[PDB]
Amino acid sequence: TAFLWAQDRDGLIGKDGHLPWHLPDDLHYFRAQTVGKIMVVGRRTYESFPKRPLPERTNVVLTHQEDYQAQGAVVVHDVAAVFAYAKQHPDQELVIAGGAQIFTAFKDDVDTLLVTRLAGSFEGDTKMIPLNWDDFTKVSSRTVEDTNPALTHTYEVWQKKA
Ligand SMILES: COc1cc(Cc2c[nH+]c(N)nc2N)cc(OCCC[C@@H](CCC(=O)[O-])C(=O)[O-])c1Br
């Protein structure tokens, strides 16, 4: 299982139910880090995607609303239904794309961290969840410089130690 996210310097992830920034290079990497996989999102992060569902992946939407309708997405109500879906498909990797209430609900079962780190600081209201960064190694780090310098970003792959 991987966590897919992008933060600012301080660990901010969201503002007012949307992204605090617009970064196109990172949302092209959101597409193709999840083209083909089982993508898990909380119900609020699903509703804030422009296309609903976004294509070519399984979108799994976690919601406590028994009646919630998302045509073409896998609508489930608890974590044990996400893993009971992921057990049915042994060839598709599980990717937890957020927000903060879903990254709490799979905190214990993550093995990889796919972080984008923005060099700047943005205003918002949601942070990334606290994680034991000492339990993971940074394997791979690739920087991309943007002509807005707050938007210069590093893509970092972390993998959990034995
Ligand atoms: C709510 O706002 C968003 C937040 C994210 C969240 C997010 C972004 N980036 C990263 N790396 N981690 C995240 N958790 C993704 C997203 O759409 C991904 C869009 C993929 C599009 C192509 C987008 C593009 O043209 O760049 C597609 O059609 O597959 C949107 Br819109």
Residues in Cβ contact with 87 at an 8 Å cutoff, skipping those fewer than 6 apart: none
Place of tokens 């791979």: 140
Ligand 1 pocket check for 48: Cβ under 6 Å? yes
The domain of 76 spans 1-162
Ligand 1 pocket check for 50: Cβ under 6 Å? yes
CATH number for the domain harbouring residue 31: 3.40.430.10
The answer to whether 70 touches 62, Cβ cutoff 8 Å, is no
Q: Taking CA 77 as the corner, what is the angle to CA 110 and CA 11, rounded to the nearest 5 degrees?
A: 40
| Helix and strand counts by DSSP (H, E) for the chain | 4, 10
Task: Write down the experimental method used for this entry.
Answer: NMR
Tokens, residue 32:
């193709």
CA distance linking residue 114 with residue 48, whole number of Å: 21
Our count of domains for the chain comes to 1
How big is the chain, counted in residues?
162
The answer to whether 26 touches 128, Cβ cutoff 8 Å, is no
- The answer to whether 57 is annotated as binding is yes
Q: How many CB atoms lie within 10 A of CB 54?
A: 18
40 CA distance to ligand 1 centroid (A)? Answer: 13
